[PDB]
Amino acid sequence: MKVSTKDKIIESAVMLFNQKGFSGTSVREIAKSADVNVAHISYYFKGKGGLMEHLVSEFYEGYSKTLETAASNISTQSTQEQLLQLVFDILSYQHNHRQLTRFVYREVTIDSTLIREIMSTYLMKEKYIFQLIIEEGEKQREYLTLPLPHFILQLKSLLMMPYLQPQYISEVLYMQPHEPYFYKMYFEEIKIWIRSVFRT
Amino acid sequence: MKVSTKDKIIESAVMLFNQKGFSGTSVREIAKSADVNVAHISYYFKGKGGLMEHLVSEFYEGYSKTLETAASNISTQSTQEQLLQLVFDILSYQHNHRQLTRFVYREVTIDSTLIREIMSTYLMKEKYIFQLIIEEGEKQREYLTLPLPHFILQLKSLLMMPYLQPQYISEVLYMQPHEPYFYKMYFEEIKIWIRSVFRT
């Protein structure tokens, strides 16, 4: 029904952290845009850094939920249709949090013990799930034509492009540079790519 | 010999725009770090936005110089060793301006008529040079196994990774996440990639 004061603060911090930078916005502007007293921010978050760490911690835990539920489907089906489901889920998760996603990938500062540690956690988990998926892929004659870290780097870099230089994506779907990003359309393009690096 | 006052200002703006954001730093902090009066900044650059546009205009014109001198070698040799030279030049240019490069690719704001127009220029030039290189590539039985916008998107996204999530690059060279970025090492990895999307 009604949005909690803590949620109002978060919603507002995402929107301004994404517009100006982290160092660009202040607790005061965040409060005024959330129509709450400044005291609420310090009470729930300690301050700007702590508000950032909450936003970054939230993003990566939502991201690794998609990873974990791909681990919980290693049975269901073939490992390439497995992988396509996980790519689809990330493209969708990225878009559903697009303001948060853009900020997390671009924010110029970041680095903050806690954040260096949130990131390390997600990367070890991401690495591990992709071996599992690729391992049971070899309990069937579906094999990567790439080492695993090579595959992950090209995947991760393609997944980030919508939030950095989307125009190149517009160009491959339209030979035009300024069409809006539709992630379901992009998925088709990544799928073709994924298919081209499996051999039977 | 001695660094010009205008250069002192630029050097300082690059270093702080890269540390905090654009909206994070002020003309006052830029002046103090350059040991020049604030008046010099307004005189040469109008202000923070105008200083940014100078830094972004400089980055892309240095980038398209590497593109233009690859156009001026369509004669010299084979189009894949052509392409490898251009990739090498960009990796090197990116690193030689690494503080500038990181800021240009990550800065959360940007967009400013002028900048929307600097970007459009470079992208049309980049697109055009890559057709030339790939066209004379077909006056010899060296062909892309990818459409041209697909090739450019994957190349451009691999070229940007050192300034966004370098750890994935460390992992492919070392199976370790925190080694320093050596662009000459990365070039070898992109070269293998480039080779895998040409057919004879």
Author numbering:
A (entry chain A), B (entry chain A): 1 to 200
Paper text:
Precise division over and capture of the forespore-destined chromosome requires RefZ, a TetR family DNA-binding protein conserved across the genus Bacillus. RefZ binds to five nearly palindromic DNA motifs (RBMs), two on each chromosomal arm and one near oriC. We propose that RBM-bound RefZ complexes function as a developmentally regulated nucleoid occlusion system for fine-tuning the position of the septum relative to the chromosome during sporulation.
RefZ crystallized as a homodimer with one molecule in the asymmetric unit of a P41212 crystal lattice. There are two major regions for dimerization contacts. Helices α7, α8, α9, and α10 form regulatory domain contacts with α7′, α8′, α9′, and α10′; α8, α10, α8′, and α10′ form a four-helix dimerization motif. A second interface is formed by α6 and α6′ at the junction between the regulatory and DNA-binding domains. In the RefZ structure (unbound from DNA), there is no obvious ligand binding pocket in the α5-to-α7 regulatory region; therefore, its affinity with DNA is unlikely to be regulated in this manner.
